[PDB]
Design a protein around this motif. Structure first.
Motif, PDB file in Angstrom:
ATOM      1  N   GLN A  20       0.807  -1.217   0.000  1.00  0.00           N
ATOM      2  CA  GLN A  20       0.000   0.000   0.000  1.00  0.00           C
ATOM      3  C   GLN A  20       0.838   1.264   0.000  1.00  0.00           C
ATOM      4  O   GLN A  20       0.341   2.319   0.382  1.00  0.00           O
ATOM      5  CB  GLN A  20      -0.950   0.007   1.196  1.00  0.00           C
ATOM      6  N   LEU A  21       2.102   1.184  -0.405  1.00  0.00           N
ATOM      7  CA  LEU A  21       2.972   2.348  -0.359  1.00  0.00           C
ATOM      8  C   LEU A  21       3.418   2.742  -1.760  1.00  0.00           C
ATOM      9  O   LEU A  21       3.609   1.881  -2.613  1.00  0.00           O
ATOM     10  CB  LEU A  21       4.221   2.081   0.488  1.00  0.00           C
ATOM     11  N   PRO A  22       3.615   4.029  -2.023  1.00  0.00           N
ATOM     12  CA  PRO A  22       4.225   4.425  -3.296  1.00  0.00           C
ATOM     13  C   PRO A  22       5.669   3.940  -3.381  1.00  0.00           C
ATOM     14  O   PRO A  22       6.289   3.515  -2.403  1.00  0.00           O
ATOM     15  CB  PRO A  22       4.146   5.958  -3.284  1.00  0.00           C
ATOM     16  N   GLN A  29      -0.001   8.077   4.831  1.00  0.00           N
ATOM     17  CA  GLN A  29      -1.129   8.153   5.745  1.00  0.00           C
ATOM     18  C   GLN A  29      -2.288   7.332   5.197  1.00  0.00           C
ATOM     19  O   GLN A  29      -2.552   7.324   3.991  1.00  0.00           O
ATOM     20  CB  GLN A  29      -1.551   9.611   5.982  1.00  0.00           C
ATOM     21  N   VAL A  30      -2.972   6.622   6.095  1.00  0.00           N
ATOM     22  CA  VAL A  30      -4.116   5.800   5.738  1.00  0.00           C
ATOM     23  C   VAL A  30      -5.230   6.018   6.755  1.00  0.00           C
ATOM     24  O   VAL A  30      -5.012   6.532   7.857  1.00  0.00           O
ATOM     25  CB  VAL A  30      -3.738   4.299   5.681  1.00  0.00           C
ATOM     26  N   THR A  31      -6.431   5.583   6.379  1.00  0.00           N
ATOM     27  CA  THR A  31      -7.625   5.685   7.209  1.00  0.00           C
ATOM     28  C   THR A  31      -8.013   4.288   7.686  1.00  0.00           C
ATOM     29  O   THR A  31      -8.250   3.394   6.873  1.00  0.00           O
ATOM     30  CB  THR A  31      -8.770   6.334   6.431  1.00  0.00           C
ATOM     31  N   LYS A  37      -6.843   7.843  11.786  1.00  0.00           N
ATOM     32  CA  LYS A  37      -5.749   7.916  10.825  1.00  0.00           C
ATOM     33  C   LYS A  37      -4.478   7.304  11.396  1.00  0.00           C
ATOM     34  O   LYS A  37      -4.216   7.389  12.604  1.00  0.00           O
ATOM     35  CB  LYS A  37      -5.497   9.362  10.396  1.00  0.00           C
TER      36      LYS A  37
END
Ligand code: HEM
Ligand code: HEM
Lengths: 399, 399
Positions: A20-22, A29-31, A37
């Motif tokens: 889930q990372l670039p 940051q994620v929800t 957060k």
């Protein structure tokens, strides 16, 4: 070329958070399911700096990062017991409680366990060698040996051990090895046993890790009996799954890299400490996330983690960080991996790390000394897949 | 520049079968939950050679490879309706039944749809541009546009298309968009609708794809009404989830590769065919496995696939085969992808492939032309994760 992948035969997928990372694995940051957060932390330097920072907390918090939706009733029950687990206490209470057990977890105190540990290993390898030449190392050594070492830590007499071995093995098995019923039951039996063990240490104290901890705790009013039982469980089982997997996966790495295994056996004094460090670093990938909540705004490299936001430390990816370990996804006992993150970092860094290191070192050394022909073996029948995954971890070896 | 990974924003993990192969991805025998045996097939050349072979079957079989454990009654259920689905018929019957729909699925037949498709696309793209620059392409175009095309194929009148569209969306959404109870609701809603649509075309025939097939089928004894209803579900919905996601995944690929987007816009006639090929090839990784059972022994490479045994074709890995596509895990519209496996191979190769190709091409051409500033709107807001994954299919774009 080489990528972060699950080890061969591993019965779990890797954590989805890793995907889930670039590119570059920046702080992301994620929800969370609750709407709170959190930040995905995957860079080795970021992990050390954040896990050493006193503004992060392990204690229950209305926006502590929780990765799945769950009934709040049993969230609440967990949060109510967090005060009785060292891993969910903040300083300064954390500092005092940890010091109650710490003297029996030093390098020198762990070392005192080596003669008994060698007897246990010699026992398991004698049995493995005496039976059929193809063996499943998970069943022959990796599961039973640490269970026995835990009993030594707890002063558990040999008569009682074989039944704690049973329940420990149930806790740590996959969903295909033991039901959700057999597990929650084996949990209950362990908790009954741990409560009776605490009582037994309070009368007739003993000079072992658990006995000295119980004694040191009794001189305070920090725990009731239920609190000592949860602490006993944590002190005995917190590392069982980890060390089981590190023993099997470490041997797997060595037989999958025979040139390094040949070099290791020629130079045990010089390459075994590095080998242990590399097994620790490389297999952090299959370990769990380390979670905290920020109590204050925390600035790091131009990003602000706000008070009340979580950090999800992607420990396994931090140990595959290319800026810290060149060619990070190559297993290589010759690399510099001394600074790995397998035990975490900061005040909660694994209390059992020296006991854990000795168990791993002694197992690797003994298998390498004793089985110069040690190699990987296919097995009777083709690999079982359930839902595309191996249902249990096994390592089939010959010599 | 490698590593097959899930696309950014993909709500599922990659197939765990992908991780069960030795280096080189040799043919790899596994044991299925039921105890039957199967082979993992990930090499492009092997996939073609095995899917070309009439010794393999799609029809129920005591040892058909089933990847999960399953109640026999629900196996039975699926097994007794396999007579009614082209995808689970072997030749010769497969050949005759396929001929009843093939004429409306040719390249020439698909091209007849281009005028109506363009009006459909122009409608959705008008509505998107009007509704405001930050838009979710999955909701705005990728879900509804192919649903409309299917309506044109089935001759579904306009007053029924809103309900059919939302039901199709329900069945392809993740578990977090819709419930398994909410999904089976839409299934039987659609199955009722399909059985009434069969009756309607039997009494008031039409020249659409579905009408022609029903008529051609009525000239034989091949199907009862329940059969025509199942067949109608397959002919209309078999490819919906694939083409929905390819439209969105293709736009993401182009934006994530601005230099290839720029070259596409500069030479649409020469590069768009290749772009469609590479969107088909590259995203095979997130498509499902293709399965067969051997009816006789099949020798290949050094291996004999015995009569009771399954093949699990890892179609997406085959489209990432390094000995067929140099740097296979690089999206590159300039490569030769004409031989890709996204539509399968042999007798069952996708019936809808020419309609699917045209839908994808027309969508990419119209979006790329209409919105010069086309970009992804991501990186600034926290991504939602549940169990560590994006909960739903979404692609936020801007222009
Ligand atoms: C390879 C073996 C092991 C690994 C990789 C490992 C890993 C870890 C990690 C990452 C933490 C920190 C978690 C956090 O910060 O939230 C931790 C803490 C802890 N570990 Fe281990 N562990 C291992 C073995 C053991 C053993 C054998 C024991 C005890 C016999 C043990 C006892 C503990 C305890 C009590 C804590 C809590 C420390 C605190 O909160 O201050 N571990 N471990
Ligand atoms: C990107 C879009 C699509 C992809 C990647 C795709 C993929 C596939 C694949 C791999 C197969 C062969 C399965 C097997 O051999 O077991 C297949 C068969 C089939 N597809 Fe598609 N499909 C797509 C679009 C469509 C569309 C739009 C339709 C209908 C309008 C459709 C209808 C069918 C049917 C009916 C079959 C069964 C053919 C047979 O068994 O003879 N597909 N598809």
């Amino acid at each position: 070329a080489k990528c972060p992948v699950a080890p061969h035969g591993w019965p779990n997928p890797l954590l989805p958070e890793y995907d889930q990372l670039p590119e570059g694995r920046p702080l992301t940051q994620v929800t969370m399911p609750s709407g709170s957060k959190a930040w995905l932390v995957a860079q080795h330097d970021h992990i050390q700096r954040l896990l050493a920072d006193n503004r992060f907390s392990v204690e229950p918090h209305p926006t502590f990062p929780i990765r799945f939706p769950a009934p709040q009733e049993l969230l609440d029950m967990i949060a109510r017991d967090a005060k009785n687990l060292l891993v969910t206490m903040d300083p300064p209470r954390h500092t005092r409680v940890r010091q109650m057990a710490l003297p029996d977890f030093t390098i020198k105190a762990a070392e005192k366990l080596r003669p008994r540990m060698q007897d246990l290993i010699d026992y398991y390898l004698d049995k493995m060698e005496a039976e059929g030449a193809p063996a499943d190392l998970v069943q022959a050594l990796a599961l039973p040996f640490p269970a026995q070492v835990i009993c030594e830590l707890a002063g558990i007499p040999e008569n009682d051990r074989e039944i704690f071995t049973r329940n420990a093995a149930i806790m740590v098995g996959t969903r295909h090895s033991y039901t959700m019923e057999q597990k929650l039951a084996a949990n209950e039996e362990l908790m009954k046993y741990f409560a009776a063990l605490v009582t037994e240490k309070q009368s007739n104290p003993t000079d072992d890790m658990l006995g000295n901890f119980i004694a040191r705790a009794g001189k305070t009013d920090e725990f009731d009996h239920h609190g000592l039982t949860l602490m006993t469980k944590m002190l005995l089982l917190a590392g069982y799954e980890f060390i089981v997997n590190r023993i099997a996966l470490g041997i797997q790495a060595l037989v999958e890299n025979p040139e390094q295994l040949a070099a290791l056996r020629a130079d045990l004094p010089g390459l075994m400490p590095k080998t242990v460090d590399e097994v620790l670093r490389y297999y952090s990938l299959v370990d769990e996330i380390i979670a905290r909540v920020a109590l204050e705004d925390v600035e790091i490299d131009g990003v602000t983690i706000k008070a009340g936001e979580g950090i999800l430390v992607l420990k396994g990816l931090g140990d595959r960080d290319p800026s810290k370990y060149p060619n990070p996804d190559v297993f290589d006992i010759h690399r510099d991996s001394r600074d790995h993150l397998a035990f975490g970092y900061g005040v909660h860094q694994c209390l059992g790390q020296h006991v854990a290191r000795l168990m791993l070192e002694m197992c690797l050394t003994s298998l390498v000394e004793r089985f110069p022909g040690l190699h990987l073996v296919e097995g009777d029948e083709p690999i079982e897949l359930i839902d595309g995954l191996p249902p249990v971890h096994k390592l089939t070896i010959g010599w």
